[PDB]
Amino acid sequence: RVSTRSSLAEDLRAIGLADGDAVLVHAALRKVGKIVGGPDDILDAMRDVIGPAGTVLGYADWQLEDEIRDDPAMREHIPAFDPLRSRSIRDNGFWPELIRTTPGALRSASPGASMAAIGGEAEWFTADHALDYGYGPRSPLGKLVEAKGKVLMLGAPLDTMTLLAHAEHLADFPNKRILRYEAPILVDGEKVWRWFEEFDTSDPPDGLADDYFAGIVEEFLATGRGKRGKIGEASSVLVPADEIVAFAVDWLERWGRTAR
Amino acid sequence: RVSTRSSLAEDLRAIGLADGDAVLVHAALRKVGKIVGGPDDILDAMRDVIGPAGTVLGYADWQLEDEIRDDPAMREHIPAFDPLRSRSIRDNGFWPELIRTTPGALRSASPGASMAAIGGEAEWFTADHALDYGYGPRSPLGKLVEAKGKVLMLGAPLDTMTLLAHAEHLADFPNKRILRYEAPILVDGEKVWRWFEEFDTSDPPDGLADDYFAGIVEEFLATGRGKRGKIGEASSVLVPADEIVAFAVDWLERWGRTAR
Ligand SMILES: CC(=O)SCCNC(=O)CCNC(=O)[C@H](O)C(C)(C)COP(=O)(O)OP(=O)(O)OC[C@H]1O[C@@H](n2cnc3c(N)ncnc32)[C@H](O)[C@@H]1OP(=O)(O)O
Ligand SMILES: CC(=O)SCCNC(=O)CCNC(=O)[C@H](O)C(C)(C)COP(=O)(O)OP(=O)(O)OC[C@H]1O[C@@H](n2cnc3c(N)ncnc32)[C@H](O)[C@@H]1OP(=O)(O)O
Ligand SMILES: [Cl-]
């Protein structure tokens, strides 16, 4: 079975992508199977479906390891985060690099939370991304909710849905672990070390498993409010951003009130 | 032992890179070893050594496979070669992709022979790349010789020195295999299939081994006119482009006169 730009576009329309949509995609590209024009056919087909005014996103992050950021002897040899040159974290697969290196793509400024975006509103989604609490309202994720966008899990494991970290941020529950770290960025065109602060997106709230995002998504799909479908050979899920965030905040806040 | 932008720069100086140099690099990056800022440190270090007027090149090619290209049923789903969008052939390693996706880089128009270039003369090296016989004088390889540039095998096996296919083009020896194939390119901004003609660069001249480039390089190094040295943990070779081509034309033409 071989996918084409044409056939991938019909698979994306079948799962629910439509004209003007903004969609953040998480992908395990190897699950799509054989593609005539390679994985670029997927991005091209998406843009065919949503049109030039739509926007595709991918979770770029960057490749600074904590083993490295923290080892002080290597401190001066670590390049600053540069949203135009820092490659995406390889843990998130080729897909965000695919977007980031496509002509016309943009990438936001908050390093660990940084998002790549292409399409009509890429300038809007990537701009004014808060350095601290980069998963809150002033981020591509918060604008995805405001713009009533969607999340596509393209063969990706369901617990890699980064949008639910934005739910973690909004949700009121006790003893949110705050994380503080120091990373090099650009200030006035020069490398500067800056202290960051965010809610922890690396580990779950104490008392839930590392993969509980997957459970939340499966509960949301159980309500019938999402859509499952095949993109190429990859089993995929399309959910509305605003609904799943409200769903996830609800879940987290109720779980929080079960404390003593 | 970990490499840095600084330490790779000193390694590149030790092997013979100098201000203003134009260097086409073939790389097996995995055996550079650990690099603090990843393989982009190598390119940054090269640019530190050669300066903004120097030029780094990598051999991009592109990804259209003969299986697909030849298959008539998928001919219409095969995207045209776009020097701005078509990713590098993956069996040349990450290095040409690394250059091609670096801001400011350029890429030439002859698909199978196409070269990515960044630096002071990148416009000149990538301009006017002949579609037929893309390894002859009107190519980045011909301009490398004219500019008296260099080739650096950065941990790469010596028989991957594509510059020697330019020597194959020049060398007068009998019964050169001519290759004819068709491939989709951009004409007037739209996809058009075009027939191509070149000397064979995928198979050696009848009567030589698939890796005879390696033997030529090793015998050139035995004249004393190349330099060996380690870039990071990778065994590397630096040769002048003009001399090795003249050396290889000599070798091929003498081998050709042993017929009859
Ligand atoms: C809680 C959080 O926030 S987690 C953060 C977000 N994480 C994510 O979004 C990740 C979602 N994906 C996953 O979790 C997947 O399981 C991941 C990526 C580990 C693994 O996915 P897999 O498909 O192995 O890998 P990936 O998605 O990179 O696809 C690889 C396909 O690349 C194509 N590809 C990669 N690079 C290129 C290229 N340069 N040119 C052409 N094709 C390429 C290939 O077909 C490659 O596979 P191959 O190695 O067989 O050739
Ligand atoms: C006849 C002809 O004309 S032949 C044509 C020319 N051919 C060439 O120039 C190829 C020369 N190289 C070779 O032959 C080598 O043996 C090749 C590439 C097969 C194999 O090289 P190897 O190092 O495996 O592979 P490569 O050079 O791609 O280095 C790989 C890695 O680089 C860095 N890497 C790759 N992608 C990224 C990325 N996205 N971000 C950061 N680093 C990356 C990594 O460390 C990745 O390795 P890992 O998988 O261990 O993490
Ligand atoms: Cl309740």
Author numbering:
A (entry chain A), B (entry chain B): 4 to 263
Please share excerpts from the published article on this structure:
Here, we conduct a comprehensive functional analysis of the Antibiotic_NAT family of aminoglycoside acetyltransferases. AG resistance is primarily conferred by three classes of aminoglycoside-modifying enzymes (AMEs): phosphotransferases (APHs), nucleotidylyltransferases (ANTs), and acetyltransferases (AACs). AMEs permanently alter the AG substrate, preventing them from binding to their target, the A-site of the 16S rRNA in the bacterial ribosome. The fold typical of the Antibiotic_NAT family is evident in all structures, composed of 13 α-helices and 8 β-strands, and determined structures superpose with pairwise RMSD’s 0.8–1.0 Å between 197 to 266 matching Cα atoms.
